[PDB]
Design an enzyme around this catalytic site. Structure first.
Site, mmCIF file in Angstrom:
data_model
loop_
_atom_site.group_PDB
_atom_site.id
_atom_site.type_symbol
_atom_site.label_atom_id
_atom_site.label_comp_id
_atom_site.label_asym_id
_atom_site.label_seq_id
_atom_site.Cartn_x
_atom_site.Cartn_y
_atom_site.Cartn_z
ATOM 1 N N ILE A 204 0.758 -1.153 0.117
ATOM 2 C CA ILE A 204 -0.020 0.052 -0.085
ATOM 3 C C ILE A 204 0.927 1.379 -0.184
ATOM 4 C CG2 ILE A 204 -1.667 1.333 1.315
ATOM 5 C CD1 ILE A 204 -3.123 -1.127 2.255
ATOM 6 N N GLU B 283 -2.647 -8.886 2.363
ATOM 7 C CA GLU B 283 -2.047 -10.038 3.067
ATOM 8 C C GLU B 283 -3.166 -11.223 2.606
ATOM 9 O OE1 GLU B 283 0.940 -10.166 3.843
ATOM 10 O OE2 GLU B 283 1.603 -8.759 5.136
ATOM 11 N N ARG C 29 -2.211 -11.940 -1.205
ATOM 12 C CA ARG C 29 -1.232 -13.109 -0.958
ATOM 13 C C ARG C 29 -1.440 -14.409 -0.539
ATOM 14 N NH1 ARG C 29 1.983 -8.208 1.811
ATOM 15 N NH2 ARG C 29 2.803 -7.084 0.063
#
Ligand SMILES: *[C@@H]1O[C@H](CO)[C@@H](O)[C@H](O)[C@H]1NC(C)=O
Length: 246
Positions: free
Chosen positions: A71, A160, A163
């Site tokens: 970010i 996250e 991912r």
């Protein structure tokens, strides 16, 4: 761009948003069937815009570097905010230029500086869809201490989750009740770059890791990942940091 609305949100609409987020990141190859993020992207196309809406419909736009899912900063009404680091300074050249003013947050975007700013480690900040709705609301009005905790929630529930499927799932379980992240979630977060590296290295080493990765499992046990047959590689990680950025 990608978008997500907290109003009427449920595990399915969140899953759909996280699927879009992953699909907005560009790649030219998969490594063991996992999209490999590009080593670099030029100009403005380096930045994905995520529009998030809180439960009342108020919005921020978050800018994400599509090479590493970091970010960079966000826009709230007519004010932009960026982390205090060169990458984010670079990004401010390209996104949210129409903002009336730009504020640079008094910290860089990494978990260590954000935990310092917030006054607590990730292990003790509950996350989930309600925590995301809170984070979006907080980021709407500048408060640097509150914003650090909000950004820790935001990173974890967007980047996250994109991912790792396991983290996406943890968030889904927390659609209606926040809860601190499991140590497994913390372990994955911390190991993303190392796993991304060892998976790329496995190609040339017959799917075997050059150096094993220690994680924590769903049950709180230490486990060691040694090769691409591990569930972590087959059925968890969804995006690989290119080794050119490690
Ligand atoms: C690789 O991973 C599996 C699953 O974790 C493990 O049980 C196996 O013994 C490992 N194999 C090799 C060849 O390192």
């Amino acid at each position: 761009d990608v978008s997500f609305r907290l109003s009427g949100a449920d595990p399915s609409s969140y899953g759909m948003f996280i699927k879009d987020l992953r699909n907005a990141l560009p790649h030219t190859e998969k490594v063991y069937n996992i999209p490999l993020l590009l080593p670099s992207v030029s100009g403005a196309g380096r930045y994905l815009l995520m529009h998030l809406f809180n439960y009342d419909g108020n919005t921020i736009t978050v800018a994400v570097d599509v090479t590493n899912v970091y970010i960079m900063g966000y826009l709230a009404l007519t004010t932009s905010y960026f982390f205090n680091e060169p990458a984010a300074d670079l990004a401010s050249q390209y996104v949210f230029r129409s903002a009336r003013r730009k504020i640079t947050l008094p910290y860089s975007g990494n978990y260590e500086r954000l935990q310092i700013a917030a006054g607590k480690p990730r292990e003790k900040i509950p996350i989930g869809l309600p925590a995301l709705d809170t984070a979006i609301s907080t980021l709407l009005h500048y408060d640097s201490t509150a914003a650090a905790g909000a950004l820790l929630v935001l990173i974890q529930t967007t980047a996250e989750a994109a991912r790792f499927k396991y983290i996406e799932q943890q968030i889904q379980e927390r659609a209606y009740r926040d809860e601190v992240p499991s140590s497994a979630t913390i372990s994955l977060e911390n190991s993303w770059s190392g796993l991304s590296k060892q998976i790329q290295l496995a190609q040339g080493n017959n799917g075997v890791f050059r150096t094993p990765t220690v994680l924590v499992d769903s049950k709180g046990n230490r486990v060691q990942i040694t090769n691409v047959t591990s569930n972590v590689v087959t059925s968890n990680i969804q995006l690989l940091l290119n080794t050119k950025n490690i």
